[PDB]
Amino acid sequence: GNAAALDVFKFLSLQYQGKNLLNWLTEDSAEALQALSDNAEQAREWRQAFIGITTVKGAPASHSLAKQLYFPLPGSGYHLLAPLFPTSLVHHVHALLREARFGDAAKAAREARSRQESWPHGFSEYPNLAIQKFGGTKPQNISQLNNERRGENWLLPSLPPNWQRQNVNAPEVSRLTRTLQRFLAKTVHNNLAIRQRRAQLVAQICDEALQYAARLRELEPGWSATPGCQLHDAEQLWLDPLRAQTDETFLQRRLRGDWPAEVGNRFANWLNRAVSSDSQILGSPEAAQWSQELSKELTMFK
Amino acid sequence: VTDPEALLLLPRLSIQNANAISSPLTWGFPSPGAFTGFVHALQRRVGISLDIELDGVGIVCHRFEAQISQPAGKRTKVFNLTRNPLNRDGSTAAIVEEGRAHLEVSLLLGVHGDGLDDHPAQEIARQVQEQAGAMRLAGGSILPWCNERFPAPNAELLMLGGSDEQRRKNQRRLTRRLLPGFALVSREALLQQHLETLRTTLPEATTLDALLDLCRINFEPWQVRDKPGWLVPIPAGYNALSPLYLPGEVRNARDRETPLRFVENLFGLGEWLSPHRVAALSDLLWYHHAEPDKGLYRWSTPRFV
Amino acid sequence: LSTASVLAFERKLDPSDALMSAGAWAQRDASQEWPAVTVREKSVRGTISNRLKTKDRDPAKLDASIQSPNLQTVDVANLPSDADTLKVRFTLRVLGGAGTPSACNDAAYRDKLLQTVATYVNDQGFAELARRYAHNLANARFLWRNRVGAEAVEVRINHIRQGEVARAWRFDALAIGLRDFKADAELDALAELIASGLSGSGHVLLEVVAFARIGDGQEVFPSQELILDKGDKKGQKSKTLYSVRDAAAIHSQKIGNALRTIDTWYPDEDGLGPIAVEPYGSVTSQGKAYRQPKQKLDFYTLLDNWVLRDEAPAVEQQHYVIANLIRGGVFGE
Amino acid sequence: LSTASVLAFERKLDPSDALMSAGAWAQRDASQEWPAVTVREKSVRGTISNRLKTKDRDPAKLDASIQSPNLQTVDVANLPSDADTLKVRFTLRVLGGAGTPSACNDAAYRDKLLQTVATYVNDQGFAELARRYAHNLANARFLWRNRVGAEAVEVRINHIRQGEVARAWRFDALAIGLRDFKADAELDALAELIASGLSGSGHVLLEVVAFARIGDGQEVFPSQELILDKGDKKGQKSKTLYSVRDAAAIHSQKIGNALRTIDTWYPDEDGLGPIAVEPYGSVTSQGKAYRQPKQKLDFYTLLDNWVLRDEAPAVEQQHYVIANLIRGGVFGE
DNA sequence: CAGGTAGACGCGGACATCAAGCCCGCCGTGAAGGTGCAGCTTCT
DNA sequence: AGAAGCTGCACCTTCACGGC
C-alpha cells in the first residue's frame, strides 16, 4: 500500500503475546476495550476498521505495466495469465544457511580435517547468487517485506555450461589419408619419386601415430579394465603405462614383445581398409611392410 | 498424439539482450516458456499459411554471456542495468532492474502437418528462418547473421523420409550441427525421486529443488556430494491464484476478448545434457500442458525416460 | 471515445551492439582481419578533487584527507600504437509495420489509430523520417565521444539482401553535419530503402561500419555499464566498460538513441539541435525535459488529440508522433 | 541559479601511454625502428633498512637486523650497453569547447556557466593557458625521473595533419627551465596552435618525441603499476613496472599530470615553481595541499563565486578555474 | 629416363646444504521514491 | 462564483567473515 500507512502495520505487528489475533483481531474481547477504554462505539468502529482493511480487495486489474502472457490452450484459444510476484521466503532459508551456522560448520570444516572427527552437521555454499533490489534507495514503496530485506531478492542461478563442469558434462590425419588415396589413384610413369612420396606420407602417418601416443601419455598413468576391449588389447599397451603406477611389476606382458607387431598389424589393417582406391584391393604384403615399419619405430623406444 | 514427422533445425541464433531474469527465484538462462511461445508465435505467423503445426522445440545454448558484475568484496553478483530517460520535469527516474544476457542457441522444432509431401523440401525451412529473423526470442533481438566469412543454413529432416540406417545416419548428421551446445531437459521424476529419498519422516516446502541447486560440502564420517549433470532450477509453468474471469471483467488487460487469470510461477528441475546422449532426438522437445480449469499452465519435455 | 488502457509499441529500427576494432587508415578495404580493442583494468593514483561535506566533521581529518592521495582502479580502452583508426561496426534491422500497436485494449481505438497512421502514410509517407534516420546513420552520431576529436570519419553501409550484399554506400560523416538535414541523392536512396523496410513490406538488414581517425595510441570509449553503487564496496572502481566477445562495444540502446535524435521541432529554440525522440521529450545531458504537458506539445496530448478528438497537429509534430510510434513504448491509462 | 547536482567535465588535452625505446645519440633522426626497452624482473638480496617495530624490538629477534639478506623481487628497465639515449613517444589530442559540461541538471546553471566561460574566452582567450601548456610540452617534464640526470634532452613535436607532419618544432628541453615561462618564437607558434585547438577552431593531434642521454646501459624509469592489494608477503613483488606489449611505458595520466603543472598562483609561498591544477591544489608526494578551503582560493569557492554570485575573481584565479575546467572531473552538490 | 634389398642400435649408478623475503600512506560522489491531501489556479 | 486538474509538501524508513 502507501508507505505512510506502514506505521499502522508497525502498530498491528506488536507481539504483545499474539500479533495474529491483533492484526485480524477477531478472537479478542479484552483488546477491544483496551484499544480505547472509554466507550464501545469508537472501540468497535476502530476494531472493524483494523480487521477490515487488512482483509479487503477492491477490484481486479493489472495496471498496464504488470506482465500478462498468452498461453496456448490445447485445441485452440488462449488465456491471458497475469503473473504476480510471490512472497515465498527462501530468503530466510538462504540467510540462515549462509550466516547462522554456516560459520560453525565452516570452522569445523576449515580447522578440523587432520582431526577426522568433526562436528555432525553440514553446510552449503550457494555459488553465483544474484542480488535484485526493487526499491532503489527507499524500498518501502514496494511493500513491507521488501523493507525487512533491503531489496535483495537473492536469485539462484541457472547458467548453462560451456563444455566444463564438476557435476557432470560432456583432422590432419584424414588429410594425409585422403592425399595418400588420391596419390595412389593416379600414376605418372611409376618412378622413384612416387615411392618417395608414398614413404613420405606413410612416414607422416606413423609419426602422427607416435604424436598421438605421446600426447595421450599426458592423461594419467593408471588406466583400468574400462570397457571396449574388442580392439583394445594390443594397442592397450602401446599407449604406455608411464612406469610409475606399476611400482611392483603387476604386468608381465609389458615387455614380453606382444604389442609392437600386433599394433603394426592392426594399424596396417586400418590403413588397408581406409586407403583403397579404384585399385581396389591393397593386400597383405603391403600390410606386412607397413606393419614392420611401425614395429621398428615402436621397438626403437627401447 | 503430439508426435512430429519432421524436425526443422534453426541454426545457431545469436541474441543480444535477452531476459537474464528468468523467475522470482531463478536467474540466468531464459525460460523454456519463452521458447515455446516463440515457436507458437512462429506457427501463428508462418505455420497456418503452410497448413503445418509447430509443437516442441529444443535448446542447445552454444554460448552464454550474462551482463553482470561482482561487487568488489561480496560473494554474490549484481546486474548491469540500463539508463532510462527523465520523467516529466527533469529528474533521474526510479530504476527497475532488468537482467540482460547475450545468448547463442540453435533450436530444432517439430513440424507436424500435412503441408509437406515432397514439394517443400528446403523452402519451408527457408521460409521459417527468413520470417523468424524479424522476431525476438526472450526479449532479445535475434541478430540475423551479417556479412561474414560463412553463412549458416537451416535444415529439415523427416523421420519417415528414410529407412532405419538412414534414420540413425540423419540423426547423427543432425547432432553434429549442434554438438558443442547443451540440451535442456525438464527433469521432474528426478525431483520427485530426490524428494522421496529426502522425505524420511520430515516435510518440505521448496527445499527439494534448492538442495539440488546448491553445492553442499558437508561431512559424513571434508567431503562433497555430487549431482548428475547440471541440475538447475527452472520455471516450469504457472499455477492459479484466481478463478478465471470473462474478457469484459478485468480492467487493463492486453485485450478484451481473452479470459484472464492471476497466476504464480511454478518451479522444477532441469538438466543441461550434451545432445550426443539423448538416445532419440524425437525427444528433447518442449510442449505445453494446460488443464485450464485447474490451473497448471505447464511446459515440459515429456517422453524422455 | 476513450483511449486504450494498454498501448504498446515495439522498437522498430532495432540496432545491434557496436564492436570496435583497430587498424590503420587506408587499410579500410581489408577491414575484416582487424583486431578488436580489449578493455583493460588499470589502477590510478589521484587526489581528493571532489568537494567536501563539512557537516558532522572536523577540519583536521578533512584537510589531512585532501593532503593524502586517493587510489582507484578504472577500466580503459586504448587504440594500439600501430592503429590510428577506430572501426565501429554494428548491424541494424528495420523491422516493418510501423504504426501497428503491439497491444491495444479497445477495438475502436485500434481501428481509429490504424486509420490515422494509414492516412498519414497515405498523404506523407516515411520520407522525412527516413531521411533523418539516414542522416543519423550517415553522420557518425553513434560515435558519442569517439567523434569529437576525429580528423576524418567515414561510414560504410551495406544492405544484406539474402545472405550477401545488394547495395553499398560510402559517406563522409563530417560534411553531413549533426545539426542540419540536407537533401542528397545517396541519402535519399538510403531513405527510400529504409522507408520500404518500414512500410511493412520488408525487414531490411543493414551493416554500418564507421572508421574514425582518432590518433595513434589514443583512448576510445565503449559505453559505460550502470552499477547503482548501493552496497558493500561495489563502487570502489568507479568505471566499468561494456565488453562482448572479449571486445569493447557500445550498448544497443545507445546506438538507438544516437540514430534516433532527429527531433528539431520542440518549443524551446529548435535551432540548437536535434534531440532524442521521447514522450515528454527529454535530454539527459542538459537535465531538462522539453515538451512538458503544460504546453500542448508532448507526445501524449498530441496522440489523443489526433486519434480521439480528430484534430490533426501541425505537419512537423505528427512526424514526432510517428517517431514515437517507431521508437516504441508503453502508454495508456 | 544554484550549482547543479551533477556536473561532469570531459578531458581536454588527452595524451596516450608514452612508449619508450632506446638507441644512440646522433642517430636521433632515423630513430623509427629503435628497439624498445623491455621490463626485466630481477631478484635482489638486500638488508633490513626499515626501522624496527615493537614486536621485532625483542633482543632475540633483532637477528633480522644482523643476518637477513631480505630477498626482494623487483622490476628494472635498462638501456642496452651500446645505447645511451632514451626515446619517449606519445600523441596528444587537444579538443576544445572547455566550458560545456557533458552532464548537467540545472539548465539555468548550465547557461550561466556557459555565459561565464564565454565572457572569459572573449575577454581573454586561451593565451596564457596554452602558453603554459606548450612550455610544459617544451621542457620534458613528462620525463619524470628520466630528466634529473640526463645530459641533454631534446624534444620534437610534429603536428600530424592527416598522416604526415604539417609543422615540426624542435626544442632543447634543458635550456627551457622548469620554473618560469619565458618567451620564444617557436614556443609562441606552438602556443598559438594549442590555443587554436583549445577554442574548437581546428583539429590538433600532436606527436611528441623526447630523447634524453641517460648513459650507456644506465637505468631508465617507466611508470610503476599501482597494485590495489593489501597485506600479504613472501611472494609479493612490491615493484611492478608498466609496459605495453613487452615495451616499457609511462602512464597516460602521468603525462597528463606533468603537462598540467601550470599553477603558479596559490596563496602560500610561490617562489618554488608551478604545481599541477587540482581543486584543493594538492601535491600528495610533498604532503601539502595548497589552496586549502580555509583560504578562499580553492576551485569550488572561486567557481561558485564566479557563476552563482557573479563575483569575478582575479585574472590568475580565472586562469586556474578554466585550467580545472580543461582538466575535467566531477563537480556539483 | 631409372635410383636396394637384409639386420640390429648396452648395461650399471648416483643427481647438495645453509640463511634470510621491508617499511609508509591513501581508496570519490552527484542521481536514480510512491501515495495521499491542501491549496492554487484556470475556466465557466 | 462554483468545478477540474496540477503542484508542493508531508509521511514512511540501515549489515554478521576465507574458489570442484
Side-chain angles (χ1 to χ4, degrees), chain A residues 1-15 18 30 32 35 40 42-62 64-113 118 120-149 151 153-161 170-185 187 192-217 219-223 225 227-228 232 234-241 244 249 252-255 257 259-261 263-277 282-302, chain B residues 1-117 120-145 151-159 161-305, chain C residues 1-27 30 32-55 57-142 144-231 235-269 271 273-333, chain D residues 1-55 59-141 143-232 235-267 271-333:
Chain A
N2 188 17
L6 263 183
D7 192 348
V8 191
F9 191 60
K10 212 147 181 294
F11 176 61
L12 281 176
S13 314
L14 287 188
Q15 210 86 34
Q42 58 265 7
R44 179 59 71 179
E45 202 275 299
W46 283 341
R47 178 254 182 193
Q48 208 162 350
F50 280 142
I51 70 159
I53 73 177
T54 40
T55 79
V56 77
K57 295 83 174 190
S62 168
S64 157
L65 289 148
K67 302 315 206 298
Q68 49 189 357
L69 312 149
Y70 296 106
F71 197 80
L73 281 166
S76 164
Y78 297 96
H79 285 165
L80 273 173
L81 288 209
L84 290 166
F85 189 87
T87 82
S88 274
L89 278 199
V90 314
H91 180 88
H92 191 195
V93 188
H94 279 163
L96 203 83
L97 267 76
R98 281 176 64 217
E99 271 96 9
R101 300 295 97 88
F102 162 73
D104 211 2
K107 69 177 289 295
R110 267 60 179 149
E111 62 92 20
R113 184 58 172 174
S118 287
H121 67 301
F123 66 104
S124 42
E125 189 175 0
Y126 288 114
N128 285 302
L129 283 156
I131 314 299
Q132 201 203 19
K133 46 180 74 67
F134 301 119
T137 67
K138 282 145 187 51
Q140 304 89 25
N141 308 306
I142 304 300
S143 68
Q144 163 62 70
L145 293 194
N146 219 51
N147 202 225
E148 308 287 333
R149 43 191 207 275
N153 207 230
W154 287 16
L155 312 165
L156 296 167
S158 314
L159 275 67
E172 61 268 15
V173 202
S174 291
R175 167 71 170 182
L176 294 182
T177 295
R178 192 252 171 205
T179 192
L180 185 50
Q181 161 188 327
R182 205 69 93 174
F183 177 57
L184 58 94
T187 50
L192 161 67
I194 287 94
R195 315 192 298 271
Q196 281 276 336
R197 198 183 263 186
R198 178 202 52 85
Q200 180 76 352
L201 287 176
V202 76
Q204 282 161 39
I205 286 174
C206 58
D207 60 53
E208 176 61 278
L210 290 161
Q211 285 157 54
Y212 173 75
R215 79 184 73 182
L216 265 297
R217 221 199 274 186
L219 188 156
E220 283 295 329
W223 290 357
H232 213 194
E235 277 144 339
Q236 175 91 49
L237 269 184
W238 156 59
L239 315 177
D240 314 277
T249 319
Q252 74 279 42
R253 63 178 184 275
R254 176 61 204 104
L255 47 90
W259 75 98
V263 161
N265 276 22
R266 196 164 66 239
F267 156 76
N269 286 12
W270 166 84
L271 200 148
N272 276 15
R273 305 163 305 120
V275 192
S276 297
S277 171
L282 188 56
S284 61
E286 292 90 344
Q289 206 269 345
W290 294 319
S291 302
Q292 69 99 37
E293 201 261 359
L294 191 67
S295 200
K296 296 200 315 307
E297 307 323 295
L298 280 191
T299 70
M300 195 66 74
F301 281 171
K302 266 169 55 190
Chain B
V1 71
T2 58
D3 282 335
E5 312 161 30
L7 272 185
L8 193 150
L9 167 74
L10 273 170
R12 39 191 67 242
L13 309 178
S14 91
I15 293 95
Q16 76 158 348
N17 298 124
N19 208 350
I21 302 295
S22 90
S23 177
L25 303 179
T26 69
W27 76 283
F29 202 70
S31 184
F35 301 97
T36 63
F38 179 73
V39 170
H40 196 82
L42 260 180
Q43 206 268 340
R44 280 185 86 259
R45 293 159 76 157
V46 179
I48 318 173
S49 64
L50 312 161
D51 209 45
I52 55 165
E53 293 92 6
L54 270 65
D55 218 351
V57 56
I59 290 97
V60 307
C61 191
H62 291 310
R63 83 174 290 137
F64 187 96
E65 184 186 15
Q67 298 187 34
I68 55 182
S69 87
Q70 181 100 30
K74 296 285 102 178
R75 185 182 295 276
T76 64
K77 287 164 193 304
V78 306
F79 288 105
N80 289 323
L81 312 186
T82 188
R83 198 176 192 183
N84 315 326
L86 320 174
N87 309 74
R88 203 152 61 245
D89 40 16
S91 87
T92 322
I95 51 173
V96 283
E97 303 189 307
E98 302 212 316
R100 329 211 291 173
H102 292 247
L103 269 53
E104 176 168 341
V105 54
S106 157
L107 49 89
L108 56 94
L109 52 89
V111 194
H112 196 283
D114 209 22
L116 48 92
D117 287 17
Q122 266 85 10
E123 59 249 27
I124 176 172
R126 267 207 291 106
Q127 182 165 355
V128 166
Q129 171 175 252
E130 85 184 8
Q131 210 274 331
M135 214 170 318
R136 40 198 56 212
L137 186 49
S141 89
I142 304 172
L143 264 54
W145 197 261
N154 64 34
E156 167 94 343
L157 272 302
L158 273 80
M159 317 294 127
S163 160
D164 173 41
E165 57 268 47
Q166 197 197 324
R167 161 172 34 232
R168 62 170 325 179
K169 266 185 162 181
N170 282 128
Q171 185 137 321
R172 194 170 70 246
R173 84 159 286 275
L174 196 41
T175 192
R176 281 190 299 193
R177 292 190 65 159
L178 47 88
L179 208 46
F182 278 88
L184 178 52
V185 179
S186 155
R187 304 214 66 86
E188 313 164 329
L190 182 50
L191 187 86
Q192 190 72 31
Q193 166 74 274
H194 179 66
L195 168 65
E196 299 187 337
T197 69
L198 165 67
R199 189 184 285 169
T200 55
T201 71
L202 73 158
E204 74 101 20
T206 184
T207 172
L208 81 171
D209 169 51
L211 201 142
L212 275 169
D213 164 65
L214 49 82
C215 176
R216 48 182 60 247
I217 188 172
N218 80 310
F219 186 71
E220 190 207 309
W222 270 25
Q223 271 99 321
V224 54
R225 300 205 308 115
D226 199 64
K227 39 183 184 299
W230 272 136
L231 296 179
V232 309
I234 47 164
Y238 306 113
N239 196 7
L241 266 79
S242 162
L244 80 163
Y245 296 119
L246 303 185
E249 196 147 341
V250 165
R251 187 182 151 82
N252 318 322
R254 268 177 81 163
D255 59 78
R256 306 181 192 164
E257 64 267 15
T258 321
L260 193 139
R261 204 199 277 272
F262 287 121
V263 286
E264 203 207 27
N265 276 116
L266 277 196
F267 291 89
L269 185 81
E271 204 186 11
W272 293 91
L273 291 170
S274 200
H276 62 256
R277 38 164 175 157
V278 284
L281 201 62
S282 158
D283 306 339
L284 211 74
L285 297 160
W286 285 90
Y287 302 95
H288 295 279
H289 282 94
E291 210 174 31
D293 50 338
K294 180 64 180 175
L296 288 174
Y297 295 82
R298 208 164 46 92
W299 45 77
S300 44
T301 47
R303 69 195 173 184
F304 198 73
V305 285
Chain C
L1 263 70
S2 190
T3 182
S5 186
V6 169
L7 189 84
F9 284 92
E10 303 201 23
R11 169 190 41 237
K12 271 83 202 175
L13 272 79
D14 165 86
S16 84
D17 284 359
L19 297 171
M20 310 160 83
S21 298
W25 196 66
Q27 297 274 327
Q32 300 98 2
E33 61 154 20
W34 276 20
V37 285
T38 55
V39 291
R40 325 180 289 109
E41 176 154 80
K42 55 149 191 177
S43 280
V44 288
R45 166 173 162 185
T47 79
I48 306 287
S49 42
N50 62 90
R51 62 176 87 202
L52 313 170
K53 300 167 301 307
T54 325
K55 327 294 170 313
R57 305 295 201 273
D58 44 351
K61 309 195 312 270
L62 61 92
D63 79 325
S65 88
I66 76 175
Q67 274 153 11
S68 74
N70 173 34
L71 312 181
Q72 311 295 321
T73 169
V74 294
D75 262 356
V76 74
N78 273 227
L79 293 170
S81 42
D82 46 52
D84 52 336
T85 283
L86 179 69
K87 188 261 283 184
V88 173
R89 190 189 142 273
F90 67 101
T91 71
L92 170 60
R93 285 192 316 167
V94 177
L95 271 301
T100 289
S102 45
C104 177
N105 284 117
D106 213 354
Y109 193 82
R110 186 179 186 90
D111 290 17
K112 276 157 85 75
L113 174 59
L114 282 187
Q115 285 170 3
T116 311
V117 63
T119 53
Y120 169 68
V121 70
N122 280 12
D123 61 356
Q124 281 197 329
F126 309 104
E128 184 86 28
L129 283 198
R131 214 174 47 98
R132 290 179 179 267
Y133 287 138
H135 282 99
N136 290 260
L137 286 171
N139 64 34
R141 207 157 202 168
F142 37 90
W144 282 87
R145 211 199 42 90
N146 309 320
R147 205 205 189 265
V148 291
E151 177 214 331
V153 279
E154 175 194 330
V155 188
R156 299 184 169 207
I157 318 164
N158 287 334
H159 175 211
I160 296 161
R161 207 172 45 162
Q162 279 282 89
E164 59 98 25
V165 73
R167 181 60 205 277
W169 284 287
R170 172 181 301 153
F171 289 131
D172 174 75
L174 272 176
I176 304 169
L178 302 187
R179 49 182 77 257
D180 269 300
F181 289 83
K182 287 296 176 299
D184 310 325
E186 309 269 0
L187 265 174
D188 266 322
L190 176 59
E192 279 160 35
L193 184 132
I194 286 171
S196 71
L198 257 188
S199 316
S201 79
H203 322 308
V204 167
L205 173 62
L206 298 169
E207 68 165 357
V208 182
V209 43
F211 304 92
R213 280 205 39 89
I214 307 179
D216 277 329
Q218 288 288 324
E219 183 193 331
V220 301
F221 186 73
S223 187
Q224 194 166 334
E225 291 178 352
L226 198 145
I227 308 106
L228 46 83
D229 305 309
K230 314 280 144 182
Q236 64 152 31
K237 69 184 292 182
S238 76
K239 197 170 188 186
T240 315
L241 301 165
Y242 189 51
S243 70
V244 281
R245 262 76 149 180
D246 286 29
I250 314 169
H251 284 60
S252 41
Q253 55 259 25
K254 196 162 184 57
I255 310 296
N257 187 91
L259 56 93
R260 223 167 59 210
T261 169
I262 63 181
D263 191 10
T264 67
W265 310 290
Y266 40 74
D268 276 311
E269 208 199 3
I275 68 168
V277 178
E278 315 259 13
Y280 325 114
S282 317
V283 198
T284 45
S285 276
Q286 285 93 22
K288 191 177 172 65
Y290 308 92
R291 317 159 156 277
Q292 302 99 340
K294 175 158 170 49
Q295 293 148 346
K296 300 306 182 184
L297 278 182
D298 50 320
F299 163 66
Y300 285 23
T301 59
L302 283 176
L303 191 66
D304 55 83
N305 276 252
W306 204 4
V307 311
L308 281 192
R309 266 88 70 184
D310 270 332
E311 167 185 333
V315 65
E316 295 95 17
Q317 318 290 339
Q318 48 196 3
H319 286 327
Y320 157 78
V321 169
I322 298 288
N324 288 242
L325 293 198
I326 297 173
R327 184 254 183 197
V330 172
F331 326 112
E333 275 80 8
Chain D
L1 58 98
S2 178
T3 309
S5 69
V6 161
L7 207 69
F9 279 91
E10 160 70 25
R11 179 174 64 248
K12 278 87 201 172
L13 276 74
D14 181 34
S16 71
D17 311 273
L19 273 81
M20 283 156 40
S21 43
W25 198 257
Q27 306 181 16
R28 297 158 284 159
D29 305 2
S31 45
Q32 275 77 240
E33 49 275 359
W34 268 9
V37 182
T38 188
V39 181
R40 185 181 62 93
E41 171 185 6
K42 71 179 179 178
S43 297
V44 291
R45 150 178 188 140
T47 40
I48 291 293
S49 88
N50 55 86
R51 48 179 89 223
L52 276 304
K53 296 302 170 184
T54 175
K55 193 47 68 203
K61 265 149 286 292
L62 55 88
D63 181 295
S65 162
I66 309 186
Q67 53 257 55
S68 67
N70 209 10
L71 299 185
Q72 294 307 312
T73 304
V74 302
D75 291 8
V76 77
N78 278 303
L79 301 111
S81 315
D82 45 353
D84 70 314
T85 305
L86 179 69
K87 158 182 166 179
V88 186
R89 187 194 171 269
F90 65 98
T91 54
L92 176 80
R93 281 183 298 159
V94 49
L95 310 178
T100 78
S102 66
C104 201
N105 308 142
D106 284 8
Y109 178 76
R110 176 158 187 158
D111 292 358
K112 191 53 183 298
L113 162 74
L114 285 187
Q115 175 182 336
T116 50
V117 173
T119 194
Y120 170 74
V121 65
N122 300 267
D123 195 6
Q124 294 188 18
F126 297 99
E128 188 73 32
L129 293 165
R131 194 175 69 100
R132 283 147 183 261
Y133 284 144
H135 273 60
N136 275 339
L137 267 183
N139 64 34
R141 210 192 288 264
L143 267 56
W144 273 87
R145 216 197 148 176
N146 298 319
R147 203 203 190 264
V148 297
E151 190 182 90
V153 183
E154 185 180 6
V155 307
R156 305 193 173 205
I157 294 162
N158 308 328
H159 179 202
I160 291 186
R161 184 89 273 185
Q162 313 190 347
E164 78 283 335
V165 312
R167 164 87 189 276
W169 300 266
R170 182 172 316 194
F171 296 121
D172 182 29
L174 292 191
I176 314 165
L178 282 181
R179 64 180 67 250
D180 36 16
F181 307 99
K182 302 290 178 51
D184 196 293
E186 308 294 282
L187 267 176
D188 293 322
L190 172 61
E192 173 266 359
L193 183 132
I194 291 175
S196 158
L198 259 181
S199 285
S201 44
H203 155 79
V204 175
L205 165 73
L206 310 172
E207 177 197 10
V208 194
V209 195
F211 316 100
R213 322 194 68 162
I214 308 298
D216 271 295
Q218 274 284 319
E219 174 166 355
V220 300
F221 314 98
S223 289
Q224 182 181 349
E225 286 197 90
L226 164 56
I227 309 300
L228 281 180
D229 275 339
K230 38 195 52 173
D232 211 340
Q236 294 303 101
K237 289 162 57 60
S238 78
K239 176 146 191 171
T240 308
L241 295 177
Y242 171 71
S243 87
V244 285
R245 297 213 295 267
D246 303 358
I250 311 180
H251 282 141
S252 56
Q253 70 264 14
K254 192 87 165 164
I255 320 292
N257 188 250
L259 57 93
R260 232 164 62 229
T261 82
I262 71 179
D263 196 8
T264 78
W265 319 288
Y266 51 90
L272 298 174
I275 72 172
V277 284
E278 293 96 324
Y280 311 104
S282 314
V283 285
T284 48
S285 56
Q286 290 179 27
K288 189 172 165 41
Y290 310 92
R291 310 170 154 274
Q292 269 176 353
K294 71 162 45 64
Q295 279 86 241
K296 300 306 176 179
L297 276 184
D298 47 316
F299 167 65
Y300 292 111
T301 72
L302 287 173
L303 184 77
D304 308 329
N305 285 8
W306 201 8
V307 182
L308 265 72
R309 274 87 68 188
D310 268 331
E311 274 143 30
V315 195
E316 300 93 5
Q317 314 305 313
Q318 285 176 24
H319 293 321
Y320 168 71
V321 163
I322 300 303
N324 273 310
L325 288 189
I326 288 169
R327 168 190 173 263
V330 173
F331 323 114
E333 194 269 330

